[PDB]
Design an enzyme around this catalytic site. Structure first.
Site, mmCIF file in Angstrom:
data_model
loop_
_atom_site.group_PDB
_atom_site.id
_atom_site.type_symbol
_atom_site.label_atom_id
_atom_site.label_comp_id
_atom_site.label_asym_id
_atom_site.label_seq_id
_atom_site.Cartn_x
_atom_site.Cartn_y
_atom_site.Cartn_z
ATOM 1 N N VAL A 151 4.107 -28.276 -4.767
ATOM 2 C CA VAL A 151 4.941 -28.350 -3.525
ATOM 3 C C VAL A 151 5.877 -27.132 -3.439
ATOM 4 O O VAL A 151 5.784 -26.404 -2.430
ATOM 5 C CB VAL A 151 5.724 -29.679 -3.416
ATOM 6 C CG1 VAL A 151 4.806 -30.849 -3.094
ATOM 7 C CG2 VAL A 151 6.565 -29.987 -4.649
ATOM 8 N N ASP A 152 6.732 -26.919 -4.449
ATOM 9 C CA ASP A 152 7.759 -25.840 -4.491
ATOM 10 C C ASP A 152 7.733 -25.197 -5.887
ATOM 11 O O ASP A 152 8.817 -24.946 -6.457
ATOM 12 C CB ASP A 152 9.134 -26.393 -4.099
ATOM 13 C CG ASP A 152 10.136 -25.336 -3.659
ATOM 14 O OD1 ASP A 152 9.782 -24.516 -2.787
ATOM 15 O OD2 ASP A 152 11.264 -25.342 -4.193
ATOM 16 N N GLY B 85 5.930 -22.161 -6.746
ATOM 17 C CA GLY B 85 5.930 -20.690 -6.606
ATOM 18 C C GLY B 85 4.523 -20.113 -6.532
ATOM 19 O O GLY B 85 4.295 -19.047 -7.140
ATOM 20 N N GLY C 295 10.561 -24.369 3.304
ATOM 21 C CA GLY C 295 10.164 -23.989 1.933
ATOM 22 C C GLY C 295 8.659 -24.045 1.719
ATOM 23 O O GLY C 295 8.181 -23.373 0.782
ATOM 24 N N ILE C 296 7.939 -24.816 2.546
ATOM 25 C CA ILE C 296 6.463 -25.045 2.454
ATOM 26 C C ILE C 296 5.730 -24.117 3.437
ATOM 27 O O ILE C 296 6.353 -23.697 4.434
ATOM 28 C CB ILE C 296 6.124 -26.535 2.689
ATOM 29 C CG1 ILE C 296 4.704 -26.870 2.222
ATOM 30 C CG2 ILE C 296 6.348 -26.954 4.138
ATOM 31 C CD1 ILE C 296 4.437 -28.347 2.079
ATOM 32 N N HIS D 270 0.518 -29.402 -1.131
ATOM 33 C CA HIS D 270 1.355 -30.557 -0.704
ATOM 34 C C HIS D 270 0.686 -31.897 -1.043
ATOM 35 O O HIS D 270 -0.564 -31.955 -1.065
ATOM 36 C CB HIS D 270 1.669 -30.468 0.795
ATOM 37 C CG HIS D 270 2.691 -31.461 1.239
ATOM 38 N ND1 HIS D 270 3.824 -31.734 0.497
ATOM 39 C CD2 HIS D 270 2.752 -32.252 2.330
ATOM 40 C CE1 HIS D 270 4.533 -32.659 1.107
ATOM 41 N NE2 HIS D 270 3.898 -32.993 2.235
ATOM 42 N N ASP E 106 12.167 -17.554 -16.672
ATOM 43 C CA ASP E 106 13.525 -16.947 -16.603
ATOM 44 C C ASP E 106 14.575 -18.033 -16.324
ATOM 45 O O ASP E 106 15.720 -17.864 -16.789
ATOM 46 C CB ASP E 106 13.588 -15.813 -15.572
ATOM 47 C CG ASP E 106 13.449 -16.257 -14.123
ATOM 48 O OD1 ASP E 106 12.667 -17.195 -13.867
ATOM 49 O OD2 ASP E 106 14.123 -15.657 -13.262
ATOM 50 N N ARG E 107 14.207 -19.103 -15.604
ATOM 51 C CA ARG E 107 15.103 -20.250 -15.279
ATOM 52 C C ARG E 107 15.330 -21.096 -16.541
ATOM 53 O O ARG E 107 14.721 -22.181 -16.653
ATOM 54 C CB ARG E 107 14.531 -21.085 -14.125
ATOM 55 C CG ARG E 107 14.796 -20.510 -12.742
ATOM 56 C CD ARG E 107 16.222 -20.729 -12.264
ATOM 57 N NE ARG E 107 16.617 -22.135 -12.252
ATOM 58 C CZ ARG E 107 16.261 -23.041 -11.337
ATOM 59 N NH1 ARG E 107 15.476 -22.716 -10.319
ATOM 60 N NH2 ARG E 107 16.693 -24.287 -11.448
ATOM 61 N N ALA F 87 9.245 -15.541 -11.847
ATOM 62 C CA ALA F 87 9.119 -15.669 -10.376
ATOM 63 C C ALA F 87 9.870 -14.529 -9.677
ATOM 64 O O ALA F 87 9.219 -13.752 -8.950
ATOM 65 C CB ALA F 87 9.634 -17.018 -9.936
HETATM 66 N N1 LIG Z 1 13.955 -17.943 -10.708
HETATM 67 C C1 LIG Z 1 13.031 -18.666 -10.059
HETATM 68 N N2 LIG Z 1 12.967 -18.664 -8.716
HETATM 69 C C2 LIG Z 1 11.961 -19.469 -8.257
HETATM 70 C C3 LIG Z 1 11.057 -20.205 -9.000
HETATM 71 N N3 LIG Z 1 10.178 -20.897 -8.180
HETATM 72 C C4 LIG Z 1 10.559 -20.583 -6.970
HETATM 73 N N4 LIG Z 1 11.619 -19.713 -6.940
HETATM 74 C C5 LIG Z 1 12.262 -19.238 -5.720
HETATM 75 O O1 LIG Z 1 12.531 -20.365 -4.918
HETATM 76 C C6 LIG Z 1 12.422 -20.012 -3.514
HETATM 77 C C7 LIG Z 1 11.441 -20.938 -2.832
HETATM 78 O O2 LIG Z 1 10.236 -21.094 -3.642
HETATM 79 P P1 LIG Z 1 8.787 -20.689 -3.068
HETATM 80 O O3 LIG Z 1 8.295 -19.466 -3.769
HETATM 81 O O4 LIG Z 1 8.806 -20.705 -1.576
HETATM 82 O O5 LIG Z 1 7.856 -21.909 -3.531
HETATM 83 P P2 LIG Z 1 6.311 -22.169 -3.186
HETATM 84 O O6 LIG Z 1 5.868 -23.267 -4.111
HETATM 85 O O7 LIG Z 1 5.657 -20.822 -3.321
HETATM 86 N N5 LIG Z 1 6.354 -22.650 -1.623
HETATM 87 P P3 LIG Z 1 5.077 -22.777 -0.610
HETATM 88 O O8 LIG Z 1 4.642 -24.216 -0.491
HETATM 89 O O9 LIG Z 1 5.428 -22.270 0.765
HETATM 90 O O10 LIG Z 1 3.919 -21.960 -1.120
HETATM 91 C C8 LIG Z 1 12.073 -18.516 -3.499
HETATM 92 O O11 LIG Z 1 13.244 -17.720 -3.364
HETATM 93 C C9 LIG Z 1 11.406 -18.315 -4.863
HETATM 94 O O12 LIG Z 1 11.459 -16.980 -5.317
HETATM 95 C C10 LIG Z 1 11.122 -20.177 -10.415
HETATM 96 O O13 LIG Z 1 10.427 -20.816 -11.224
HETATM 97 N N6 LIG Z 1 12.169 -19.372 -10.863
#
Ligand SMILES: Nc1nc2c(ncn2[C@@H]2O[C@H](COP(=O)(O)OP(=O)(O)NP(=O)(O)O)[C@@H](O)[C@H]2O)c(=O)[nH]1
Lengths: 180, 258, 123, 465
Positions: D40-41, D43, D63-64, D106, D159-160, D225
RNA sequence: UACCUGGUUGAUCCUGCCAGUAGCAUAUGCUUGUCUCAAAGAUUAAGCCAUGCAUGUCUAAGUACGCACGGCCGGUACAGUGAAACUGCGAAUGGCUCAUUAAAUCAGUUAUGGUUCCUUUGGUCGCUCGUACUUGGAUAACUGUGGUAAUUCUAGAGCUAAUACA
RNA sequence: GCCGGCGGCGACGACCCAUUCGAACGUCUGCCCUAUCAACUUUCGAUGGUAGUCGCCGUGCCUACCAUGGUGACCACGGGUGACGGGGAAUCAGGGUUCGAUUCCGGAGAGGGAGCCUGAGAAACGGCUACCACAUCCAAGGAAGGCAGCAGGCGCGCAAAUUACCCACUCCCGACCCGGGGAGGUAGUGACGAAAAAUAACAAUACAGGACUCUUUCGAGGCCCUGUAAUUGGAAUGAGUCCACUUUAAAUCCUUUAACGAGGAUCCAUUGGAGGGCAAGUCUGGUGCCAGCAGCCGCGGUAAUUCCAGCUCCAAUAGCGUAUAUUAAAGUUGCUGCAGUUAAAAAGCUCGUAGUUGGAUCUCUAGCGUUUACUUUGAAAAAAUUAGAGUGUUCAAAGCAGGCCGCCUGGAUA
């Protein structure tokens, strides 16, 4: 804006009553006698005759001394003598009204090709003309509705290329000659 | 519309050029000059259509830009330059000189003249005025403004001008019993002799002209041009002697020739 | 078996031309190519076939006659000058550049968007 | 007729035999189609924006993501990011080049009901440490196992941790070995957990540089990320894996393997199709037979549009016009009457060989679970979506929630659509509604809807709808 | 070709309309071998538009110190082809469409003796009684330093032309 | 070049006058429906007068001061128009009715209004400035908009083509023979519609075939016709396939012409009807006032001349149905030319203004005669269109060309 003309004209009038015995007979007699394709070709000649008759009728109403009537009358009569539906004796405007469809259908190239004895049937003539066998003067015509001029009558000859006249065997004779 | 028009549609061109319908959408469009757009002739028409020299539009400018053609003893390279009534077109390459005279049926005819006659031209005076220390002035039908005219020259008279100079050699008064030519209306191109004029104050003056073949016709004063003194013309006439012979004897002549 | 006639001639000193209407009589065979008309006409008028230009041949219905337009120039220089480029290119005296109207009108509208000597650089 | 049909079939057979015996080998291979899945979220996207170096990621109005698209990275970018760490084979001739396809992940519309149009040569699975394994990740690896293709697994949120020494654009091995020991122990413990969590699901996974033997093994590549540590290691392992494994399958031959991927309604272009042009030199002004919902459609190509390199099919970009185009790219096509079409089906390009038919019952076997299930005969709700993928997603939701649907359409809402919603209103007042997802409502449609008893549900985020 | 025929009644003669009959245009159905000519987003929405193109231009003859080219002749101001830019002209024509508009538009007829007019074509241009063998200052182009995420955006610095500006 | 000065041939310029192309204001006469629009205009200019202002000028165009006018049942004013106006189109005895967005002429507007720079010319929109409505990019600071030009897309709907190629033709613009032009030309889509015209022709066999001659009948023939023969026969050939040309800016199409190409010549003619109107079957299965047909009258309830089929026949024919606006038929809008005792219809009755109509009679001295209407003649009146002269486009619709062995023509006329 475009450099094209849109001057197009209808050459036949359909009958008022579509189904009428006495009429249908009369048209089918004309077809049968002069081997015409369809009733459009009879209506075409009726329409042309009607227009000539209407021109004669609207000329008659003017006085006998009018320059316009004289000039137009003479020109019409000259053309109808030229095409060969009258003679020099009967060359009065009054006699234009005494013509009929027979007189005009006699002048078809199909009819003349049959009447001069090039073809041996009214149906054969139309095919022979359409197959590019017949030629007037030094010109190969394939138009059954070519209306022959009075002076152009005395030479309808076979087109020289033609197997019938020219002296060159066609596909059937060539194929039979090779397998002979 | 805004400002002046630059184009001219083919069918909207004046009939006496005899442009056909299918060749194009546009026409020559005679440019501004001494003669009116309606009553002039572009050189492109004269060369291409009348003399049959050029085939396309390019060949006409290829002729003209090599400077072989003069109009009234002056070199014109403009292919749409308006040359009108009495104008002498000179081709000094082939040594051919033409005067633009209307024929019987009312159009500019390809009427050749001797090179000796391509020295002068006749011209109808439009007005006469005087100005700035009284040097009187004259204005003519082909817009040639001439200073110090002969005081016997009044309005509607004809003047003969030498083309090499710009001076009047001789002049003809507009009086009864003078040879004239019609340059407008139904009777355009007919030559005849004046019988009388009927003055209509605050309106157009009408004149009566008798033809050489006993034919009498009327015309407006503006569409009259004196060509001869008495009955004798001062210029050569076209193939026909300006005699409007009717369709009856037109046919008789054509059938007689055959 | 081809017979060449000429119909309306003219000695056009104005364009240094001899222009005429070509009548070709060819009863049995197809429409004669332009090169044979050129050399037979050149032979008829006692000139080089190089300085001859013919076009617009419409073969009559039946195929006995073909009518076209012909013209012979006084010298090849006047021919090179006066004759249009399309009729040179058939003889092979003129070459056209292999660029489309789309391409040159595209590059024009790109060339508008820069000022100075950099207009030539955009290519 | 039948003799023309017979020789048409035989000349088709000749052509495909020539296109089989053509078969160019000895290097110059095809660009692999790198697929990316997630939960879902996690990356799964925005890592692609980090690969291509695009500033606009957050511009999605949520975000999706809700579409398919191919980023189209071409060798200069591979070489540019390669020269940074510089591992092996400087200016390699043997590399075709990379083609990455993004997939929306999703719970609802079951990960794009996928059916990921297959063609997942190298599938990238985001695992994302922070949360461990996820139900969409297990059903995705089940799907990847169903049709046996080679796939790898990447970590995102390494990194998180709060304590990671963020040293961007450097080696994963180095950056991991330059941290404290307790964090490495925590990473190797959760790595072991992931390895066991794959081992139990009929896999054999490991950390991308031990043995490796990727014939049986799968590569756990740790990536960051935001910072971008591992992106080098990623693209290296991708090109290595494709070079080692896909040596024969990725031949630059001359068959006709164009596949209909996405359908879109764009302003002043009609209905456009996004196609992943893999094999077949299809020409501008050449007939194509697109497989449709209501039978096949004969389409004439008006031209070929491609977005700029290192740019997605996300935002309306300056799409460059191309007359013709070689078989290694993902391109947008537009023509006449591309209204009703099916997604995830092969596209036949036809020359003038007098109409070559009948290849549809041989395609439409057990993939009938699509839009075709329309009950015009009965009553139902009206549905509209930006792209076709979204329309399928809405219909399978309605199928799951048990609601019949009457009419479907692609593009913005018009007065005919609200009139079809109105002609429903007579039958069942509740059913007279329009479900509009990520499309522009028109003023005349809206005012006509408000004047009648017809409600419209407008929403850009599908949750709201 | 100055044309009629069925239908109220148990039957008749009427008035009278409905129906039939032929032509012309828009749509549409089914059918469709050859050849010429040829209309075509007007009606509803003068509703809304992605993208590409539709107005540019140099002769011997306004301004040539861009080596972008090679050429004389080598003490010859300027051999020539000529990008760029200044200057001149065009862009008010053409094309599209019919929203508006009811003595308005427009048509035929007359008037400017009540007005303007690029251009062309003629006339006029030492008719004036008071440094000249050629006067002055700048700015493009070019070179060089730049700003802004962004446009046919433009500021600062150093030269140099006129049929530009005086 | 001529004996340090004097000059020929142009090109750019130029105050002003004339001219050409215009443009702008006017003069007279002419327009569809509406009285459920009868009085309107003049506070804030309506009609006129004097003086100015402004304008390129004439003028209530505008200001000042005065006058109280101006238009109207001969239809003002107001409202409606699925109204741009003409040249024209369809139909048609004579009269008429209906259409005219659309290629030529004139007007208007570039999403809606308004204001202006430059210029000879614009209240310009492929010029600018602002607001109103929509909408593009964005680092959120700002930036940029105008297809009712050619393509193309969306919408709207019963309703309409290619993101094509070229300045070669016709012309336009520029310093210009040389550059440019979605003006325009040429292809593609095209059963809007119009012209010509395939889908067979001939010969030989038999008819319990027809006519003409012989015999009173039976029965006798190279005199002339005949078909529902898949009987017999070679002769002719365009449709397609495909060289070569010619055509063309380059191609295409056509015309020309090698090679191939006709026996269910399966190289296959359809669309509607067969009770009457109205040309064609009381033939045979099926259904049973159900299904359906039928413009109208009517047909269907167990022998359907009309339904669904088979067979046969008729109509027009590469075309023929169906719907809808419109014309003739309609002497059912009546001027020519209709009705009103009972079929629909003369006001209950009389007066009366406007309107229309109105009894005999009257036989030239540069200015006139009492002035018109009426009628005949004359000049003026754009081509295209329509009528119509000439001309073998191979015939025709067309076109404006062409014809004779360098020539003789035409491009009328009404
Ligand atoms: N440091 C860090 N930032 C992250 C991580 N995962 C997501 N982010 C950040 O969180 C924000 C939203 O995440 P996103 O990349 O849209 O998630 P997604 O799963 O790719 N979404 P989508 O369903 O649209 O493909 C962005 O600024 C992204 O860089 C992670 O593991 N670490």
């Amino acid at each position: 804006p475009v450099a094209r003309s849109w001057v197009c004209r209808k050459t036949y009038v359909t009958p008022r009553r579509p189904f009428e015995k006495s009429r249908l007979d009369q048209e089918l007699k004309l077809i049968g006698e002069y081997g015409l394709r369809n009733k459009r070709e009879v209506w075409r000649v009726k329409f042309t005759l009607a227009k000539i008759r209407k021109a004669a009728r609207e000329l008659l109403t003017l006085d006998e001394k009018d320059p316009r009537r004289l000039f137009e009358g003479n020109a019409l009569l000259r053309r109808l003598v030229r095409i060969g539906v009258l003679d020099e004796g009967k060359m009065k405007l009054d006699y234009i009204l005494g013509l009929k469809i027979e007189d005009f259908l006699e002048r078809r190239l199909q009819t003349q090709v049959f009447k001069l004895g090039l073809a041996k049937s009214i149906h054969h003539a139309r095919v022979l003309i359409r197959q590019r066998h017949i030629r007037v003067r030094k010109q190969v015509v394939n138009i059954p509705s070519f209306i022959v001029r009075l002076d152009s009558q005395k030479h309808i000859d076979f087109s020289l290329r033609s197997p019938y006249g020219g002296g060159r065997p066609g596909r059937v004779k060539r194929k039979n000659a090779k397998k002979g | 519309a805004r400002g002046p028009k630059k184009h001219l549609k083919r069918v909207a061109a004046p009939k006496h050029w005899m442009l056909d319908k299918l060749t194009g959408v546009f026409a020559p469009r005679p440019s501004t000059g001494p003669h009116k757009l309606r009553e002039c002739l572009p050189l492109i028409i004269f060369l291409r259509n009348r003399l049959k020299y050029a085939l396309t539009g390019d060949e006409v400018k290829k002729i003209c830009m090599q400077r072989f053609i003069k109009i009234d003893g002056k070199v014109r390279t403009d292919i749409t330059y308006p040359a009108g009534f009495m104008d002498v077109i000179s081709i000094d390459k082939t040594g051919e000189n033409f005067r633009l005279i209307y024929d019987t049926k009312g159009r500019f005819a390809v009427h050749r003249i001797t090179p000796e006659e391509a020295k002068y031209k006749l011209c109808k005076v439009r007005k006469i005025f005087v100005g700035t220390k009284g040097i009187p002035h004259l204005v003519t039908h082909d817009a040639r403004t001439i200073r110090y005219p002969d005081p016997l020259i009044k309005v509607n008279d004809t003047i003969q001008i030498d083309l090499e100079t710009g001076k009047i050699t001789d002049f003809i008064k507009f009086d009864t019993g003078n040879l004239c030519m019609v340059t407008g209306g139904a009777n355009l191109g007919r030559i005849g002799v004046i019988t009388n004029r009927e003055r209509h104050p605050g309106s157009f003056d009408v004149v009566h002209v008798k033809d050489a073949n006993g034919n009498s016709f009327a015309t407006r004063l503006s569409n009259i041009f004196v060509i001869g003194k008495g009955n004798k013309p001062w210029i050569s006439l076209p193939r026909g002697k300006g005699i409007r012979l009717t369709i009856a004897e037109e046919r008789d002549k054509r059938l007689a020739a055959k | 078996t081809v017979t060449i006639r000429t119909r309306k001639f003219m000695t056009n000193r104005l364009l240094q031309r001899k222009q005429m209407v070509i009548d070709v009589l060819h009863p049995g065979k197809a429409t004669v190519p332009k090169t044979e008309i050129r050399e037979k006409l050149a032979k008829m008028y006692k000139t080089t076939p190089d300085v001859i230009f013919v076009f617009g041949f419409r073969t009559h219905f039946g195929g006995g006659k073909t009518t076209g337009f012909g013209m012979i120039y006084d010298s090849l220089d006047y021919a090179k000058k006066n004759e249009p480029k399309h009729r040179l290119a058939r003889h092979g005296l003129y070459e056209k550049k292999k660029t489309s109207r789309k391409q040159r009108k595209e590059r024009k509208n790109r060339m508008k968007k820069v000022r100075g000597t950099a207009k030539a650089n955009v290519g | 007729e039948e003799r023309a049909y017979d020789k048409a079939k035989r000349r088709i057979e000749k052509r495909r035999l020539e296109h089989s015996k053509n078969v160019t080998e000895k290097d110059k291979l095809r660009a692999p189609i790198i697929c990316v899945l997630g939960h879902v979220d996690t990356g799964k996207t925005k890592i692609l924006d980090k690969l291509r170096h695009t500033h606009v990621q957050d511009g999605e109005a949520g975000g999706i993501t809700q579409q398919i698209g191919a980023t189209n990275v071409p060798l200069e970018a591979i070489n540019e990011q390669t020269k940074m760490i510089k591992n092996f084979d400087r200016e390699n001739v043997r590399i075709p080049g990379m083609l990455i396809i993004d997939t929306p992940g999703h719970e609802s519309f079951s990960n794009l009901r996928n059916r990921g149009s297959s063609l997942c040569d190298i599938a990238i699975l985001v695992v994302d440490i922070m949360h461990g394994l996820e139900p969409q990740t297990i059903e995705s690896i089940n799907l990847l196992k169903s049709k046996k293709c080679p796939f790898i697994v990447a970590l995102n949120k390494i990194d998180r941790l709060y304590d990671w020494k963020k040293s961007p654009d450097s080696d994963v091995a180095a950056t991991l070995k330059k941290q404290k020991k307790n964090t490495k122990d925590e990473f190797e413990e959760r790595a072991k957990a992931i390895i066991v969590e794959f081992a139990q699901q009929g896999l054999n996974a490991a950390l991308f540089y031990e043995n490796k033997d990727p014939r049986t093994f799968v590569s756990l590549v740790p990536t960051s990320a935001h910072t971008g540590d591992g992106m080098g290691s990623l693209i290296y392992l991708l090109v290595e894996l494709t070079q080692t494994m896909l040596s024969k399958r990725l031949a630059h031959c001359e068959e006709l393997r164009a596949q209909v991927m996405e359908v879109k309604a764009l302003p002043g272009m009609g209905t456009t199709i996004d196609v992943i042009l893999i094999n077949g030199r299809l020409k501008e002004g050449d007939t194509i037979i697109v497989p449709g919902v209501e039978g096949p459609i004969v389409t004439q190509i008006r031209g070929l549009l491609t977005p700029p390199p290192m740019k997605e099919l996300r935002v309306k970009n300056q799409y460059e016009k191309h007359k013709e185009v070689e078989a290694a790219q993902g391109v947008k096509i537009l023509g006449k009457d591309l209204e009703k079409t099916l997604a995830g089906l092969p596209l036949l390009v036809a020359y003038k060989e007098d109409e070559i038919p009948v290849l549809k019952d041989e395609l439409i076997h057990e993939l009938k679970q699509t839009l075709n299930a329309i009950k015009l005969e009965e009553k139902g709700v009206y549905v509209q979506a930006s792209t076709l993928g979204s329309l399928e997603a809405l219909l399978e939701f309605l199928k799951t929630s048990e609601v019949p649907y009457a009419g479907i359409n692609i593009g913005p809402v018009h007065k005919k659509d609200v009139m079809k919603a109105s002609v429903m209103l007579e039958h069942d007042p509740q059913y007279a509604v329009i479900l509009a997802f990520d499309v522009r409502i028109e003023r005349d449609a809206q005012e006509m809807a408000d004047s009648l008893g017809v409600r419209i549900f407008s929403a850009e985020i599908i949750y709201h709808l």
